[PDB]
Amino acid sequence: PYKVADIGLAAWGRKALDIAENEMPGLMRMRERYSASKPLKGARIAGCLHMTVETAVLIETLVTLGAEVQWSSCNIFSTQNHAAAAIAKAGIPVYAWKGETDEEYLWCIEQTLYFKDGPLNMILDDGGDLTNLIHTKYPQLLPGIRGISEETTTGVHNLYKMMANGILKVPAINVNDSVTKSKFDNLYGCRESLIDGIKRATDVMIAGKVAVVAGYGDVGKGCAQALRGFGARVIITEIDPINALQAAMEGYEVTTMDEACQEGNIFVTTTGCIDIILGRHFEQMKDDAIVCNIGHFDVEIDVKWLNENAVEKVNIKPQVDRYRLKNGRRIILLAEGRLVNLGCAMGHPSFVMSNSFTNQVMAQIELWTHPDKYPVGVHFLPKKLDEAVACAHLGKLNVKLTKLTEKQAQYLGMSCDGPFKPDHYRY
Amino acid sequence: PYKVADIGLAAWGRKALDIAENEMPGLMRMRERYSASKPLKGARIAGCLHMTVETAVLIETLVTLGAEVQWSSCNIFSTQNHAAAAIAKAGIPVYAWKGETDEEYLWCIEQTLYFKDGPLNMILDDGGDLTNLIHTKYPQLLPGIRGISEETTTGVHNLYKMMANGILKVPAINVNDSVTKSKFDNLYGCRESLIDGIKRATDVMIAGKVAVVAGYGDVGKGCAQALRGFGARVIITEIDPINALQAAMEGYEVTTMDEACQEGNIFVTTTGCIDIILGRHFEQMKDDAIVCNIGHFDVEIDVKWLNENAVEKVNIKPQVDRYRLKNGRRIILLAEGRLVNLGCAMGHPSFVMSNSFTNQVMAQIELWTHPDKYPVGVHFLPKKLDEAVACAHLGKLNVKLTKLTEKQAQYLGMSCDGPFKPDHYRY
Amino acid sequence: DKLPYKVADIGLAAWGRKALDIAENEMPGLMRMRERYSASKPLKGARIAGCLHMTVETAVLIETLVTLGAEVQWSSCNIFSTQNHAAAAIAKAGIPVYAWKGETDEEYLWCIEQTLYFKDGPLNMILDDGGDLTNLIHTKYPQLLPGIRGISEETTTGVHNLYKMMANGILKVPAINVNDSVTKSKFDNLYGCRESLIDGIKRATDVMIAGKVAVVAGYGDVGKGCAQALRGFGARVIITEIDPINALQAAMEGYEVTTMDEACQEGNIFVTTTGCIDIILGRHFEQMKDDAIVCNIGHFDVEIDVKWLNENAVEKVNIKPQVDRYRLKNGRRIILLAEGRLVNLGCAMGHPSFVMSNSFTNQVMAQIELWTHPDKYPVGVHFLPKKLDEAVACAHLGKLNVKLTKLTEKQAQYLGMSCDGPFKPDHYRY
Amino acid sequence: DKLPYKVADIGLAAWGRKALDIAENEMPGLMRMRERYSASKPLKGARIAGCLHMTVETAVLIETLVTLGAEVQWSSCNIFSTQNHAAAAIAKAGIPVYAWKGETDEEYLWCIEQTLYFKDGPLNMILDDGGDLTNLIHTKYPQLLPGIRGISEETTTGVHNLYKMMANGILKVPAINVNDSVTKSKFDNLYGCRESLIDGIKRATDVMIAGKVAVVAGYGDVGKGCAQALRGFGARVIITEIDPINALQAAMEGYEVTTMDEACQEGNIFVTTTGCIDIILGRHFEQMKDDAIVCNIGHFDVEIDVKWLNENAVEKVNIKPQVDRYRLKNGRRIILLAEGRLVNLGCAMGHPSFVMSNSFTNQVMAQIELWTHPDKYPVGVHFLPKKLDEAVACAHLGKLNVKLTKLTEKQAQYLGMSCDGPFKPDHYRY
Ligand SMILES: NC(=O)c1ccc[n+]([C@@H]2O[C@H](COP(=O)([O-])OP(=O)(O)OC[C@H]3O[C@@H](n4cnc5c(N)ncnc54)[C@H](O)[C@@H]3O)[C@@H](O)[C@H]2O)c1
Ligand SMILES: NC(=O)c1ccc[n+]([C@@H]2O[C@H](COP(=O)([O-])OP(=O)(O)OC[C@H]3O[C@@H](n4cnc5c(N)ncnc54)[C@H](O)[C@@H]3O)[C@@H](O)[C@H]2O)c1
Ligand SMILES: NC(=O)c1ccc[n+]([C@@H]2O[C@H](COP(=O)([O-])OP(=O)(O)OC[C@H]3O[C@@H](n4cnc5c(N)ncnc54)[C@H](O)[C@@H]3O)[C@@H](O)[C@H]2O)c1
Ligand SMILES: NC(=O)c1ccc[n+]([C@@H]2O[C@H](COP(=O)([O-])OP(=O)(O)OC[C@H]3O[C@@H](n4cnc5c(N)ncnc54)[C@H](O)[C@@H]3O)[C@@H](O)[C@H]2O)c1
Ligand SMILES: Nc1ncnc2c1ncn2[C@@H]1O[C@H](CO)[C@@H](O)[C@H]1O
Ligand SMILES: Nc1ncnc2c1ncn2[C@@H]1O[C@H](CO)[C@@H](O)[C@H]1O
Ligand SMILES: Nc1ncnc2c1ncn2[C@@H]1O[C@H](CO)[C@@H](O)[C@H]1O
Ligand SMILES: Nc1ncnc2c1ncn2[C@@H]1O[C@H](CO)[C@@H](O)[C@H]1O
């Protein structure tokens, strides 16, 4: 019926949820407005997202809207046991825990495919692991699936690659590229959870350190800003000249890893790309350099090299390894190269996840309630809905939004109700 | 042949240009690479942009590429006399000076329409004043015009309105919405020139003051950040819930002008919208509140109200008026509500304008060299060219850009040469 | 008879040692002290009773003192601040330590009393943090005062107490104000809190900082850091203050400065840093927004009226250790961290090890100074020489790869100054 | 005989007055002084010779001193710092002022000499900024020293000189160090420079700050502000320093700290703030990037080797007043601002009027203190009482709508402190 580390944590879990709800006004309005309507009636939503306190509230929201949900984790150390327990206690099949093996991980996603009253008809994925599993292993269920929504940047890039090669057989909504997700989650989320992750693992001082951030997209920007705020000297690496110039214009030295590896005290990878930190970098690092990743998959840091070339590996505590190298110096690796904010901390705070997840619900609704508008392709949520997500969070922050007058709306040639920006606007 | 305030300033002008060139690597590469090719051969580019030191370098670049240029200003107090003089000294008809009347302003744009060897075949406008003049007054020249490029946000919004109502008869390239413009010019440009404008006019202390910024788009963001940096408490107003939430997430109180007018020491309008600061606001302002605008046209502040309701208007010096109100308190107005960074300072520094203008040249080229790709419509510059502009500025900043390996480029499914981002990416 | 020590779990010793090994690499100031003095053992014959948070950083300090030849017995200066694996590591090393996380007020007093007597005589040196060890001896063990050579005090509240004792003529032992060493006050209090405050809030609540209104009471060194950290994460910070100079500083930095009576209606997060009583009261609690987070980082739990929450709330739910969620008659909730005790050490690991190396290098120097040069220090409250203050900073420049400029002989003569310092006059504020 | 004054253009008086009217609204500290003392005229019989930048802000100070019943004669303390319309406004008010923008070194000395003698006796009070007026009298007019009741000194370089004179036994008049009033040092030097440095660079060059590498030499109060301002606009700031404590501060704030020998190869902008000679030399100039901007904001033009640029450059082109562009043998160019003189006042209008109100309120208090309570001040260098220091800050809280908290009687007794202050011990560094 489910699978977790300890059901006895459900009580504590429920508390952490009650607290989360006040921090998630977005998702609460959805429950407020759709509870009686039950738009998601008939939908069996198979989920593969980090089983956390924040996700628990999302899972319960989908249920409040009248759906059946089965949940797996998308990372083997991201799950929060007490959050997984409260959900499991509510009669909702959840298969996830903290510290899964790859075989265990794959085995979890498999339990969420089949419900009591039939296979899954909805995917809510991030990274596309569930998406790619059903496309490769279970292509006989693809026709039964009505729609899918993708949370993260790497997962939508994959959804664009599949569609191009004509192997994407199910319609999909790019939830990452809702402004309210990409511009808040990736940025402000990592901005607050990065250092938290590093701190819990190492308790290292950030001030006075040189920190090297590989990549300056939305995630890199947040990471950079955070480290800067605590008095680190931040060095950026980048392949994109536009992003690189943005970093230079903010006062960041922009150079290569081949150079930066020699002066960094702290290393954070955010590229979504392979081969970012390699043996030739490690060998040049200062003693007890702290290396961690916050990209979606654990492919940015060459962990294999450390395991193969170090003289000794000492485990300090879970998700914290200290390698001694043949040069005598040591490398502190976090979460074995898996994303550090969920691996060594609690991931993003509930408020920002409310934004991401208020998007996710609108996407699950729009795929199940209006399947017409969305044919087999990679689609966006309309700006007006994107605006509605943001608007829904203004109350809690005591933001007082201005309303255009008739005269002003005419002068601008837009509606008082929105949308207020053209589609190409970048905020 | 031309019209300026003083040709005797040309010598000083030339110096300020020689200095500008080192700060404008973007535009220098264009001269380096196209001088011999003369792609703009045959093009008579009528220009309506702020006649400044930065613009002078742009004008000369278009000439270096083999074009005939006639230049007018787009604002009546933005022109820099010594810059206008150096251009006029180089045998290039320029009709612009600092302190023009509306009749003088219109009269300037009119001289740039007709060259020695025929009418204009290219527009390089901002705000769309030249665009709208030729469409309304001289529709007989529209067919002779090959293409147009628009610098600023208000001007492209107008170019979208014209196309919608089917009155835009000439193809146009949205240069504002090149990432390299919108994300650098509007943001980093105003970030540095706003306070400069305010300082030269008033020399007021920013620290300890409450500053009210109306609008939180790219311009508002820059203004807000700047004022914050000097220790002002910044209050934002906004109509867009997405922008408003962005401001809240940066630590800015977001409320209405109706409230903020009561506590602001400094007022900056950035909306591009009418009726932002009104009589009911002025009456509530603290004594010697400094009010200024940095949107493109002078329609955001109700200057007419001040002139009609104040008990006395005292001029402190050019572009600085001090009104005494019937309540006894005083309002310090800058530049009569026209944009303050060009009115009371020198506008944006050359480096950022190099970015904007390296875009402008590519747009002038693409309209004159490849007219096929661009039919009557509002078009964007391709990302690869957008990336090239940024790349061209990395050298001067000693930025060392990373190059993807073959293996990495394959994994990402993109080219080593770019483009590195999908079209919907927002940076 | 006498327990050799008392800690939560001796089994945590191995883990603690690892944390000690890592910490050492971040505390060059103390490691230089060991290297320089391990052979000479200046603190030989010293019997130092230490009352100060039993963290990993303090462990490194303890072993430094021992390396210098001292005998050391230790307790924590707060009931929630001990880090059990660090305690175990010390206990396992054969050093008498009496501390664990979650002490009763009575157990806390007991822990201090076990540090007072050594196998070969009473304590003859004091290393204190808040004055609790200092007051206990002056009040309950005055016959031990002539046998104590000196006192070094870590924190602001503590040195304030020292100065009051001196003015009223009741301080009987010479003391060094370590808090007001430049390399402590301007670094520990400021930069340490700037990182550890958020740490304690996050571990306890995992709340989004961005978009919140945060009220910081007091704008001294601790307040400055706290405020900076919160605004850094996108919170709008409001400041309360009684000192017009500190308040003007806050305003000049772009903070709204106002009273708690006003700010209690706005804040989503409250942080007290005053070292003063009665900062947040019932009348404030009753006006707060729902699930307002309330915590203190001043030395003593006296700034927040927790007893009011306990007597007047209609519900009280323990969320997890050092996190309680009250509900008031108005039906709105208050989250209280660490029962009003200082939240960085209560709900997290306190200051990072690097900045603590500054503070603790000052502590070691002070101990050496009082122990080996008593006649320099008559009964009173003294500062370390600026020369030594500068040496502390210098000892940490290497790790950060700072390259310090050296004055030419001409420049030094122009400034009327020694090349080797001191480089500032006594009244310099940095 | 004796000119009543000498200024650039008396016609600029009307404009200056407007600027004076505006400035007054931003200088509550001085305007409170007028209101409180205009009737009592504590400075009656005083004959104050002032040597300090003749800006709009100083004008407001001058008229404040007169309102208090003083006779005042004024000159500028720098040859490029005078604001001619402000000078005209004062001259027109019938106050003898000798100052204009662009003085020769010889004219500068002449200007000071005209302030020394009044219609009814020699000067009996000194208000100085850098010690130039102080040194001139001690060296060339020692027979005037017994007739001078006191000296108030504005800036760091000046008070350094005062302390040296006292140590060597050559200072003959009592003096108040105004620079090291908290409300001066921690505000003027820091917040003022944070705004006026960029001002001077911008007016002179209009250069993009964002993306540039900026080298700030020295990290004291001036350096802190300068550095902060540059990084705020998106420059990557590199710091040089001789003091290990100041250097550690810089590092802790995320700045690269290194030597000028290293940084001269990287910087696009250079800013000296040391108050020390020989900061930027020929060997540094020769390694700089093309069109590197070089300026100083320390009090004297001694930090940059301008004479080297003048003797060794192959080209020198004046771009505009106080902006010269050199070319070296290597064919790369150097832009020098204000001929090495302090660039905020040289190429702009100096500090904004609000923060100068702090400094100048301290100046007025010092003048009153020395003039009406001489016996409090024997020959030496003294500080203002913290009570008065606090009063300065308090006088400026109203304009910023700061709401200061008042201690309850219980809180005050707990802190062992007066409700009306002073709220900090003497050694507090804020
Ligand atoms: N840990 C989390 O909670 C979390 C949250 C959001 C996103 N993510 C993940 O973070 C990664 C990026 O997210 P983003 O939204 O920042 O994507 P993004 O595309 O905005 O940023 C990626 C940046 O990496 C740069 N880059 C790529 N290869 C590089 C290389 N070899 N060297 C240097 N720079 C390189 C690109 O130029 C790009 O700017 C993705 O894997 C996404 O799934 C994680
Ligand atoms: N002065 C300069 O040098 C300079 C440079 C670039 C752009 N601009 C001008 O600045 C203006 C905006 O530029 P942008 O790129 O910032 O455009 P933008 O659309 O990003 O920002 C405009 C913001 O104004 C807000 N807004 C509109 N009406 C409002 C109202 N009544 N109250 C509050 N907020 C309101 C919108 O929500 C939007 O976010 C345009 O007029 C543009 O031409 C000037
Ligand atoms: N938890 C830690 O790790 C840590 C670290 C350093 C210091 N401390 C403690 O923190 C407290 C403050 O340290 P500090 O060095 O910042 O002291 P400080 O004296 O520099 O600043 C304290 C501020 O509180 C202000 N204040 C006093 N009463 C007030 C009131 N009723 N309302 C508002 N403001 C008020 C004072 O004016 C002063 O500015 C002390 O108790 C010290 O021991 C704790
Ligand atoms: N232009 C203005 O408006 C203005 C305002 C205030 C002060 N000042 C002047 O600015 C100068 C500094 O003022 P401050 O109060 O910042 O003095 P300060 O003594 O606080 O800091 C000066 C710094 O320079 C450092 N230093 C000395 N020699 C050095 C060297 N060779 N290399 C690197 N660093 C070195 C010192 O260590 C010190 O930290 C003084 O001359 C003062 O009069 C000017
Ligand atoms: N606490 C959280 N719960 C669920 N998903 C999260 C959390 N924090 C970050 N994420 C998501 O994890 C993904 C990274 O793989 C991103 O899409 C990001 O939004
Ligand atoms: N110095 C300058 N020269 C020319 N155009 C400028 C300058 N500074 C800002 N602008 C442009 O002015 C427009 C505002 O009307 C924007 O498009 C902006 O890029
Ligand atoms: N990690 C830590 N270990 C020991 N003492 C600490 C730590 N962090 C902060 N402190 C001390 O706590 C005191 C507050 O009571 C401060 O004086 C500070 O030196
Ligand atoms: N606008 C100004 N008017 C007068 N003096 C000023 C101004 N700005 C800075 N100063 C003074 O210049 C001195 C530096 O020589 C500082 O002590 C400072 O007080």
mmCIF file with all atom_site columns, N, CA and C and ligand atoms in Angstrom, chain C residues 155-157 189 218 220-222 241-242 246 273-274 297 299 344 351, chain D residues 424 428, ligand 3:
data_model
loop_
_atom_site.group_PDB
_atom_site.id
_atom_site.type_symbol
_atom_site.label_atom_id
_atom_site.label_alt_id
_atom_site.label_comp_id
_atom_site.label_asym_id
_atom_site.label_entity_id
_atom_site.label_seq_id
_atom_site.pdbx_PDB_ins_code
_atom_site.Cartn_x
_atom_site.Cartn_y
_atom_site.Cartn_z
_atom_site.occupancy
_atom_site.B_iso_or_equiv
_atom_site.pdbx_formal_charge
_atom_site.auth_seq_id
_atom_site.auth_comp_id
_atom_site.auth_asym_id
_atom_site.auth_atom_id
_atom_site.pdbx_PDB_model_num
ATOM   1   N N   . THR C 1 155 ? 32.042 37.821 26.252 1.00 0.00 ? 155 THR C N   1
ATOM   2   C CA  . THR C 1 155 ? 30.936 38.508 25.583 1.00 0.00 ? 155 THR C CA  1
ATOM   3   C C   . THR C 1 155 ? 30.503 39.815 26.248 1.00 0.00 ? 155 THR C C   1
ATOM   4   N N   . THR C 1 156 ? 29.703 40.581 25.511 1.00 0.00 ? 156 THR C N   1
ATOM   5   C CA  . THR C 1 156 ? 29.347 41.942 25.883 1.00 0.00 ? 156 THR C CA  1
ATOM   6   C C   . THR C 1 156 ? 28.606 42.009 27.214 1.00 0.00 ? 156 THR C C   1
ATOM   7   N N   . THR C 1 157 ? 27.598 41.162 27.377 1.00 0.00 ? 157 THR C N   1
ATOM   8   C CA  . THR C 1 157 ? 26.826 41.165 28.609 1.00 0.00 ? 157 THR C CA  1
ATOM   9   C C   . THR C 1 157 ? 27.758 40.895 29.782 1.00 0.00 ? 157 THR C C   1
ATOM   10  N N   . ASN C 1 189 ? 31.009 39.013 16.763 1.00 0.00 ? 189 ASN C N   1
ATOM   11  C CA  . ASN C 1 189 ? 29.664 39.504 17.005 1.00 0.00 ? 189 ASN C CA  1
ATOM   12  C C   . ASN C 1 189 ? 28.974 39.861 15.697 1.00 0.00 ? 189 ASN C C   1
ATOM   13  N N   . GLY C 1 218 ? 17.590 46.327 18.537 1.00 0.00 ? 218 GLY C N   1
ATOM   14  C CA  . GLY C 1 218 ? 18.985 46.643 18.798 1.00 0.00 ? 218 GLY C CA  1
ATOM   15  C C   . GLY C 1 218 ? 19.799 46.633 17.517 1.00 0.00 ? 218 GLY C C   1
ATOM   16  N N   . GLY C 1 220 ? 23.527 47.053 17.513 1.00 0.00 ? 220 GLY C N   1
ATOM   17  C CA  . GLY C 1 220 ? 24.939 47.020 17.833 1.00 0.00 ? 220 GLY C CA  1
ATOM   18  C C   . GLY C 1 220 ? 25.620 46.033 16.913 1.00 0.00 ? 220 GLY C C   1
ATOM   19  N N   . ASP C 1 221 ? 26.742 45.482 17.343 1.00 0.00 ? 221 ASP C N   1
ATOM   20  C CA  . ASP C 1 221 ? 27.496 44.611 16.463 1.00 0.00 ? 221 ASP C CA  1
ATOM   21  C C   . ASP C 1 221 ? 26.672 43.387 16.082 1.00 0.00 ? 221 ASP C C   1
ATOM   22  N N   . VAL C 1 222 ? 25.952 42.821 17.047 1.00 0.00 ? 222 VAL C N   1
ATOM   23  C CA  . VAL C 1 222 ? 25.118 41.656 16.779 1.00 0.00 ? 222 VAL C CA  1
ATOM   24  C C   . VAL C 1 222 ? 23.962 42.046 15.866 1.00 0.00 ? 222 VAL C C   1
ATOM   25  N N   . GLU C 1 241 ? 15.784 50.723 18.316 1.00 0.00 ? 241 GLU C N   1
ATOM   26  C CA  . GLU C 1 241 ? 17.012 51.146 18.956 1.00 0.00 ? 241 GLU C CA  1
ATOM   27  C C   . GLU C 1 241 ? 16.758 52.276 19.949 1.00 0.00 ? 241 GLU C C   1
ATOM   28  N N   . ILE C 1 242 ? 17.583 52.330 20.989 1.00 0.00 ? 242 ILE C N   1
ATOM   29  C CA  . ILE C 1 242 ? 17.495 53.378 21.998 1.00 0.00 ? 242 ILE C CA  1
ATOM   30  C C   . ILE C 1 242 ? 18.618 54.394 21.827 1.00 0.00 ? 242 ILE C C   1
ATOM   31  N N   . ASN C 1 246 ? 23.462 54.665 16.935 1.00 0.00 ? 246 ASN C N   1
ATOM   32  C CA  . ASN C 1 246 ? 23.184 53.381 16.298 1.00 0.00 ? 246 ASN C CA  1
ATOM   33  C C   . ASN C 1 246 ? 21.963 53.463 15.381 1.00 0.00 ? 246 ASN C C   1
ATOM   34  N N   . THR C 1 273 ? 18.440 41.516 20.019 1.00 0.00 ? 273 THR C N   1
ATOM   35  C CA  . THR C 1 273 ? 19.897 41.540 20.099 1.00 0.00 ? 273 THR C CA  1
ATOM   36  C C   . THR C 1 273 ? 20.394 42.598 21.077 1.00 0.00 ? 273 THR C C   1
ATOM   37  N N   . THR C 1 274 ? 19.567 42.954 22.052 1.00 0.00 ? 274 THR C N   1
ATOM   38  C CA  . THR C 1 274 ? 19.823 44.126 22.885 1.00 0.00 ? 274 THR C CA  1
ATOM   39  C C   . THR C 1 274 ? 20.646 43.845 24.130 1.00 0.00 ? 274 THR C C   1
ATOM   40  N N   . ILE C 1 297 ? 18.956 36.367 20.384 1.00 0.00 ? 297 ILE C N   1
ATOM   41  C CA  . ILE C 1 297 ? 20.344 35.983 20.174 1.00 0.00 ? 297 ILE C CA  1
ATOM   42  C C   . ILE C 1 297 ? 21.254 36.785 21.109 1.00 0.00 ? 297 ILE C C   1
ATOM   43  N N   . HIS C 1 299 ? 22.762 37.373 24.942 1.00 0.00 ? 299 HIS C N   1
ATOM   44  C CA  . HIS C 1 299 ? 23.376 36.299 25.733 1.00 0.00 ? 299 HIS C CA  1
ATOM   45  C C   . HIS C 1 299 ? 22.419 35.562 26.684 1.00 0.00 ? 299 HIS C C   1
ATOM   46  N N   . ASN C 1 344 ? 21.150 30.929 17.708 1.00 0.00 ? 344 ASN C N   1
ATOM   47  C CA  . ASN C 1 344 ? 22.183 30.441 16.802 1.00 0.00 ? 344 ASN C CA  1
ATOM   48  C C   . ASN C 1 344 ? 22.833 29.179 17.362 1.00 0.00 ? 344 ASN C C   1
ATOM   49  N N   . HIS C 1 351 ? 28.453 30.171 15.818 1.00 0.00 ? 351 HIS C N   1
ATOM   50  C CA  . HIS C 1 351 ? 29.358 30.766 14.844 1.00 0.00 ? 351 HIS C CA  1
ATOM   51  C C   . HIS C 1 351 ? 30.220 29.714 14.153 1.00 0.00 ? 351 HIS C C   1
ATOM   52  N N   . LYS D 1 424 ? 26.555 54.202 25.699 1.00 0.00 ? 424 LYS D N   1
ATOM   53  C CA  . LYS D 1 424 ? 27.703 53.346 25.417 1.00 0.00 ? 424 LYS D CA  1
ATOM   54  C C   . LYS D 1 424 ? 28.917 53.735 26.255 1.00 0.00 ? 424 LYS D C   1
ATOM   55  N N   . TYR D 1 428 ? 33.528 52.133 23.103 1.00 0.00 ? 428 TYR D N   1
ATOM   56  C CA  . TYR D 1 428 ? 32.628 51.523 22.121 1.00 0.00 ? 428 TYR D CA  1
ATOM   57  C C   . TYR D 1 428 ? 32.990 51.997 20.710 1.00 0.00 ? 428 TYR D C   1
HETATM 58  N N1  . LIG E 2 .   ? 24.525 34.548 20.365 1.00 0.00 ? 3   LIG E N1  1
HETATM 59  C C1  . LIG E 2 .   ? 25.816 34.901 20.028 1.00 0.00 ? 3   LIG E C1  1
HETATM 60  O O1  . LIG E 2 .   ? 26.528 34.136 19.389 1.00 0.00 ? 3   LIG E O1  1
HETATM 61  C C2  . LIG E 2 .   ? 26.336 36.260 20.453 1.00 0.00 ? 3   LIG E C2  1
HETATM 62  C C3  . LIG E 2 .   ? 27.480 36.814 19.890 1.00 0.00 ? 3   LIG E C3  1
HETATM 63  C C4  . LIG E 2 .   ? 27.934 38.061 20.312 1.00 0.00 ? 3   LIG E C4  1
HETATM 64  C C5  . LIG E 2 .   ? 27.235 38.777 21.291 1.00 0.00 ? 3   LIG E C5  1
HETATM 65  N N2  . LIG E 2 .   ? 26.112 38.215 21.845 1.00 0.00 ? 3   LIG E N2  1
HETATM 66  C C6  . LIG E 2 .   ? 25.261 38.910 22.894 1.00 0.00 ? 3   LIG E C6  1
HETATM 67  O O2  . LIG E 2 .   ? 24.382 39.694 22.127 1.00 0.00 ? 3   LIG E O2  1
HETATM 68  C C7  . LIG E 2 .   ? 24.043 40.865 22.885 1.00 0.00 ? 3   LIG E C7  1
HETATM 69  C C8  . LIG E 2 .   ? 24.449 42.091 22.072 1.00 0.00 ? 3   LIG E C8  1
HETATM 70  O O3  . LIG E 2 .   ? 25.775 41.970 21.709 1.00 0.00 ? 3   LIG E O3  1
HETATM 71  P P1  . LIG E 2 .   ? 26.296 43.533 21.050 1.00 0.00 ? 3   LIG E P1  1
HETATM 72  O O4  . LIG E 2 .   ? 27.756 43.335 21.251 1.00 0.00 ? 3   LIG E O4  1
HETATM 73  O O5  . LIG E 2 .   ? 25.500 43.522 19.769 1.00 0.00 ? 3   LIG E O5  1
HETATM 74  O O6  . LIG E 2 .   ? 25.968 44.597 22.198 1.00 0.00 ? 3   LIG E O6  1
HETATM 75  P P2  . LIG E 2 .   ? 26.002 46.137 21.722 1.00 0.00 ? 3   LIG E P2  1
HETATM 76  O O7  . LIG E 2 .   ? 25.824 46.820 23.047 1.00 0.00 ? 3   LIG E O7  1
HETATM 77  O O8  . LIG E 2 .   ? 26.956 46.449 20.618 1.00 0.00 ? 3   LIG E O8  1
HETATM 78  O O9  . LIG E 2 .   ? 24.504 46.521 20.913 1.00 0.00 ? 3   LIG E O9  1
HETATM 79  C C9  . LIG E 2 .   ? 23.393 46.291 21.711 1.00 0.00 ? 3   LIG E C9  1
HETATM 80  C C10 . LIG E 2 .   ? 22.365 47.275 21.188 1.00 0.00 ? 3   LIG E C10 1
HETATM 81  O O10 . LIG E 2 .   ? 21.125 47.115 21.854 1.00 0.00 ? 3   LIG E O10 1
HETATM 82  C C11 . LIG E 2 .   ? 20.589 48.421 21.934 1.00 0.00 ? 3   LIG E C11 1
HETATM 83  N N3  . LIG E 2 .   ? 19.494 48.389 22.925 1.00 0.00 ? 3   LIG E N3  1
HETATM 84  C C12 . LIG E 2 .   ? 19.540 48.310 24.326 1.00 0.00 ? 3   LIG E C12 1
HETATM 85  N N4  . LIG E 2 .   ? 18.327 48.297 24.885 1.00 0.00 ? 3   LIG E N4  1
HETATM 86  C C13 . LIG E 2 .   ? 17.437 48.372 23.801 1.00 0.00 ? 3   LIG E C13 1
HETATM 87  C C14 . LIG E 2 .   ? 16.015 48.403 23.719 1.00 0.00 ? 3   LIG E C14 1
HETATM 88  N N5  . LIG E 2 .   ? 15.262 48.356 24.848 1.00 0.00 ? 3   LIG E N5  1
HETATM 89  N N6  . LIG E 2 .   ? 15.396 48.477 22.508 1.00 0.00 ? 3   LIG E N6  1
HETATM 90  C C15 . LIG E 2 .   ? 16.219 48.525 21.409 1.00 0.00 ? 3   LIG E C15 1
HETATM 91  N N7  . LIG E 2 .   ? 17.568 48.510 21.329 1.00 0.00 ? 3   LIG E N7  1
HETATM 92  C C16 . LIG E 2 .   ? 18.149 48.431 22.566 1.00 0.00 ? 3   LIG E C16 1
HETATM 93  C C17 . LIG E 2 .   ? 21.797 49.268 22.445 1.00 0.00 ? 3   LIG E C17 1
HETATM 94  O O11 . LIG E 2 .   ? 21.536 50.590 22.161 1.00 0.00 ? 3   LIG E O11 1
HETATM 95  C C18 . LIG E 2 .   ? 22.916 48.701 21.571 1.00 0.00 ? 3   LIG E C18 1
HETATM 96  O O12 . LIG E 2 .   ? 23.049 49.407 20.375 1.00 0.00 ? 3   LIG E O12 1
HETATM 97  C C19 . LIG E 2 .   ? 24.901 40.829 24.198 1.00 0.00 ? 3   LIG E C19 1
HETATM 98  O O13 . LIG E 2 .   ? 24.087 40.268 25.161 1.00 0.00 ? 3   LIG E O13 1
HETATM 99  C C20 . LIG E 2 .   ? 26.060 39.901 23.818 1.00 0.00 ? 3   LIG E C20 1
HETATM 100 O O14 . LIG E 2 .   ? 26.547 39.153 24.870 1.00 0.00 ? 3   LIG E O14 1
HETATM 101 C C21 . LIG E 2 .   ? 25.636 36.981 21.434 1.00 0.00 ? 3   LIG E C21 1
#
